Amino acid sequence: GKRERMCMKIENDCIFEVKHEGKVTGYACLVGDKVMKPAHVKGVIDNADLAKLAFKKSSKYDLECAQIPVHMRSDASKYTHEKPEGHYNWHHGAVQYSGGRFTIPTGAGKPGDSGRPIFDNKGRVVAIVLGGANEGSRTALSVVTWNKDMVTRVTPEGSEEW
Amino acid sequence: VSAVVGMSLLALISIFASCYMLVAARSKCLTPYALTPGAAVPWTLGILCCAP
């Protein structure tokens, strides 16, 4: 409904896409005053200005970061750090979080969909999806958090790198 | 001549290895703060290492 329309409205401007061999293979996001880009996916960002920008890399956390220029300063994603339990929005349905773990219904997460941020109820961004592992009718999520000042990765067993 | 050349080379490689590994230790200690959106490095760690 209206919430879906507003989610699409943000996604048309905040989340970008990377392409390779004429095919899109990863999504990059702008959170706070930085950029997030999971490091397993390679390609050219479909934006002339961002591509020329110099990046940074850390294979420990499987992400690439940078600093945004001042002409997408307004196009922020309103970061936050609180994690109450409940349900959380995503482009591929509503994801619920309990016991320090993220759970999705079975095969709603698709290969090559990594890099899409999660949204809380107030629309703030809380984590970036990296990969998933399944058990029964539910599939666990491997995401990176923003606890205070140090990012932390949490990965379930046998996670499939999307 | 050979002994002096060898000693100088060994000293140079030792110094270079130590400096490079210390730089790596700095870069690995201060790497997560550049990935966290927002926030800021503590002033003490930003003084004992040059933090941009």
Short mmCIF file of C-alpha atoms in Angstrom, two decimals:
data_model
loop_
_atom_site.label_atom_id
_atom_site.label_comp_id
_atom_site.label_asym_id
_atom_site.label_seq_id
_atom_site.Cartn_x
_atom_site.Cartn_y
_atom_site.Cartn_z
CA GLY A 1 0.00 0.00 0.00
CA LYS A 2 1.23 3.45 0.99
CA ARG A 3 4.16 1.95 2.90
CA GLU A 4 5.15 -0.08 -0.18
CA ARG A 5 4.89 3.07 -2.31
CA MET A 6 7.13 5.06 0.06
CA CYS A 7 9.65 2.19 0.26
CA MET A 8 9.80 2.21 -3.54
CA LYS A 9 10.12 6.00 -3.43
CA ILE A 10 13.25 5.79 -1.31
CA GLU A 11 14.66 2.83 -3.25
CA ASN A 12 14.38 4.77 -6.52
CA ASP A 13 16.94 7.27 -5.15
CA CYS A 14 19.04 5.73 -2.33
CA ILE A 15 20.12 2.24 -3.42
CA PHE A 16 22.27 1.98 -6.56
CA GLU A 17 23.26 -1.00 -8.71
CA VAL A 18 26.50 -2.46 -10.05
CA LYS A 19 26.71 -4.13 -13.45
CA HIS A 20 29.01 -6.61 -15.18
CA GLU A 21 28.88 -8.11 -18.69
CA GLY A 22 25.64 -6.24 -19.31
CA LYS A 23 24.09 -7.79 -16.20
CA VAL A 24 23.39 -6.26 -12.80
CA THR A 25 25.10 -8.26 -10.05
CA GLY A 26 25.21 -6.15 -6.88
CA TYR A 27 23.59 -3.24 -5.08
CA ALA A 28 25.39 -0.44 -3.25
CA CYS A 29 23.80 1.85 -0.66
CA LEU A 30 24.40 5.29 0.85
CA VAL A 31 24.01 5.28 4.64
CA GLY A 32 24.78 8.26 6.86
CA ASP A 33 27.74 10.10 5.32
CA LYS A 34 29.51 7.02 3.89
CA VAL A 35 28.87 4.37 1.23
CA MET A 36 28.43 0.64 1.78
CA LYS A 37 29.32 -1.89 -0.88
CA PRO A 38 29.76 -5.61 -0.07
CA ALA A 39 33.19 -6.64 -1.27
CA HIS A 40 32.41 -10.01 -2.87
CA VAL A 41 30.66 -8.40 -5.86
CA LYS A 42 32.76 -6.81 -8.61
CA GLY A 43 31.74 -4.46 -11.38
CA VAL A 44 31.25 -0.85 -12.43
CA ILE A 45 28.73 1.26 -10.52
CA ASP A 46 26.05 2.63 -12.87
CA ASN A 47 26.96 6.21 -11.99
CA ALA A 48 29.71 8.32 -13.54
CA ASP A 49 30.37 10.45 -10.45
CA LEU A 50 30.64 7.66 -7.87
CA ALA A 51 32.80 5.42 -10.07
CA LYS A 52 35.54 8.06 -10.34
CA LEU A 53 35.61 8.27 -6.53
CA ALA A 54 38.41 6.35 -4.81
CA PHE A 55 37.33 3.48 -2.57
CA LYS A 56 38.61 1.56 0.46
CA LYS A 57 38.63 -2.19 1.07
CA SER A 58 38.64 -4.67 3.97
CA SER A 59 38.30 -8.37 3.17
CA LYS A 60 37.78 -9.13 6.87
CA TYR A 61 34.31 -7.52 6.79
CA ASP A 62 33.61 -8.06 3.07
CA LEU A 63 32.62 -4.44 2.46
CA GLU A 64 34.02 -1.38 0.67
CA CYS A 65 33.52 2.10 2.13
CA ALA A 66 34.12 5.71 1.10
CA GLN A 67 33.01 9.28 1.76
CA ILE A 68 30.12 10.81 -0.18
CA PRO A 69 30.63 14.10 -2.05
CA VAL A 70 28.49 17.10 -1.17
CA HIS A 71 25.96 16.74 -4.00
CA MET A 72 24.19 13.73 -2.50
CA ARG A 73 24.48 15.00 1.07
CA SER A 74 20.69 15.38 1.26
CA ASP A 75 20.14 11.85 -0.12
CA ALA A 76 20.92 10.19 3.21
CA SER A 77 19.41 7.06 4.76
CA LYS A 78 18.97 8.24 8.38
CA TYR A 79 21.16 5.74 10.21
CA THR A 80 20.39 4.37 13.68
CA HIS A 81 21.85 1.91 16.17
CA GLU A 82 19.03 0.60 18.40
CA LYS A 83 17.90 -3.03 17.98
CA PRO A 84 14.60 -3.76 19.73
CA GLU A 85 12.99 -7.06 18.79
CA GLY A 86 10.14 -7.14 16.29
CA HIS A 87 9.52 -7.10 12.55
CA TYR A 88 11.63 -5.17 10.03
CA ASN A 89 10.94 -4.12 6.45
CA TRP A 90 12.88 -5.10 3.34
CA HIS A 91 12.42 -4.90 -0.44
CA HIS A 92 11.66 -8.66 -0.45
CA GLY A 93 9.12 -8.75 2.38
CA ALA A 94 9.03 -8.20 6.12
CA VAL A 95 11.88 -9.74 8.13
CA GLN A 96 11.60 -10.48 11.84
CA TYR A 97 14.48 -10.47 14.31
CA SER A 98 14.70 -12.44 17.54
CA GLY A 99 17.45 -13.91 19.70
CA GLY A 100 20.21 -11.91 18.03
CA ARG A 101 19.40 -13.55 14.68
CA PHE A 102 17.66 -12.50 11.48
CA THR A 103 15.10 -14.87 9.96
CA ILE A 104 13.48 -14.88 6.52
CA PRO A 105 10.77 -17.08 5.04
CA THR A 106 12.54 -19.74 2.94
CA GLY A 107 13.40 -18.61 -0.59
CA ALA A 108 12.47 -14.93 -0.53
CA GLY A 109 16.14 -13.95 -0.73
CA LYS A 110 17.55 -14.49 -4.19
CA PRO A 111 21.11 -15.02 -5.47
CA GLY A 112 22.80 -11.77 -6.41
CA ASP A 113 20.54 -9.64 -4.19
CA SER A 114 23.30 -8.76 -1.70
CA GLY A 115 23.80 -5.16 -0.62
CA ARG A 116 20.19 -4.21 -0.06
CA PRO A 117 19.81 -2.52 3.33
CA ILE A 118 17.19 -3.44 5.91
CA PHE A 119 14.77 -0.85 7.27
CA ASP A 120 13.25 -0.63 10.73
CA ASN A 121 9.67 0.45 11.45
CA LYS A 122 10.68 4.13 11.53
CA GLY A 123 12.39 3.61 8.15
CA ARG A 124 15.95 3.90 9.48
CA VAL A 125 18.62 1.52 8.19
CA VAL A 126 19.98 -1.08 10.59
CA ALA A 127 22.09 -3.60 8.62
CA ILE A 128 23.23 -4.67 5.15
CA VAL A 129 22.40 -8.14 3.85
CA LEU A 130 25.42 -10.23 2.83
CA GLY A 131 24.30 -13.86 2.57
CA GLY A 132 21.93 -16.47 3.91
CA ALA A 133 21.70 -20.02 5.21
CA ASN A 134 18.52 -22.10 5.34
CA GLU A 135 17.02 -24.53 7.84
CA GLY A 136 13.53 -25.89 7.27
CA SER A 137 10.99 -23.34 6.07
CA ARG A 138 13.12 -20.44 7.36
CA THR A 139 16.48 -19.12 6.17
CA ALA A 140 18.97 -17.40 8.45
CA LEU A 141 20.64 -14.14 7.44
CA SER A 142 24.31 -13.10 7.51
CA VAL A 143 24.31 -9.33 8.03
CA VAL A 144 26.65 -6.66 9.38
CA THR A 145 25.50 -4.45 12.25
CA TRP A 146 26.46 -0.96 13.42
CA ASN A 147 26.72 -1.54 17.16
CA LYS A 148 27.99 1.77 18.58
CA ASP A 149 31.22 2.66 16.76
CA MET A 150 32.53 -0.74 15.60
CA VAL A 151 30.80 -2.70 12.85
CA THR A 152 30.30 -6.37 13.68
CA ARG A 153 29.56 -9.30 11.37
CA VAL A 154 27.33 -12.20 12.40
CA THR A 155 27.18 -15.25 10.17
CA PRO A 156 25.20 -18.49 10.53
CA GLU A 157 26.70 -21.88 9.69
CA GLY A 158 26.94 -22.85 6.04
CA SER A 159 25.99 -19.38 4.83
CA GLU A 160 25.51 -19.02 1.07
CA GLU A 161 27.19 -15.87 -0.26
CA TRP A 162 24.60 -14.05 -2.36
CA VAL B 1 83.60 -4.54 0.75
CA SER B 2 81.34 -7.59 0.58
CA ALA B 3 80.80 -7.67 4.36
CA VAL B 4 79.93 -3.97 4.52
CA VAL B 5 77.49 -4.31 1.61
CA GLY B 6 75.80 -7.31 3.20
CA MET B 7 75.51 -5.68 6.62
CA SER B 8 74.04 -2.50 5.16
CA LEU B 9 71.53 -4.49 3.11
CA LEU B 10 70.45 -6.55 6.13
CA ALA B 11 70.00 -3.43 8.25
CA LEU B 12 67.95 -1.78 5.49
CA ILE B 13 65.63 -4.76 5.02
CA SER B 14 65.14 -5.10 8.78
CA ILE B 15 64.21 -1.42 9.11
CA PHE B 16 61.84 -1.59 6.14
CA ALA B 17 60.10 -4.72 7.42
CA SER B 18 59.62 -3.25 10.89
CA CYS B 19 58.24 0.03 9.53
CA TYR B 20 55.88 -1.70 7.09
CA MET B 21 54.52 -4.06 9.73
CA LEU B 22 53.96 -1.19 12.17
CA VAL B 23 52.10 0.71 9.44
CA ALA B 24 50.00 -2.42 8.84
CA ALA B 25 49.23 -2.63 12.57
CA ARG B 26 48.07 0.99 12.53
CA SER B 27 45.92 0.46 9.44
CA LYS B 28 44.33 -2.67 10.90
CA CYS B 29 43.64 -1.03 14.26
CA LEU B 30 41.97 2.01 12.67
CA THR B 31 40.18 0.24 9.80
CA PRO B 32 36.72 -0.33 11.39
CA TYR B 33 36.14 3.32 12.35
CA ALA B 34 36.20 4.35 8.68
CA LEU B 35 33.48 1.78 7.90
CA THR B 36 31.04 2.71 10.69
CA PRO B 37 28.53 5.30 9.41
CA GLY B 38 28.75 8.42 11.47
CA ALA B 39 30.62 8.16 14.77
CA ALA B 40 34.18 9.36 15.38
CA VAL B 41 37.54 7.98 16.47
CA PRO B 42 38.40 8.73 20.12
CA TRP B 43 40.69 11.70 20.58
CA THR B 44 43.31 9.60 22.38
CA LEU B 45 43.56 7.03 19.59
CA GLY B 46 43.32 9.91 17.12
CA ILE B 47 46.37 11.45 18.79
CA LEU B 48 48.56 8.36 19.23
CA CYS B 49 47.80 7.69 15.56
CA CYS B 50 47.10 10.35 12.94
CA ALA B 51 43.37 9.94 12.26
CA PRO B 52 41.94 11.86 9.24
#
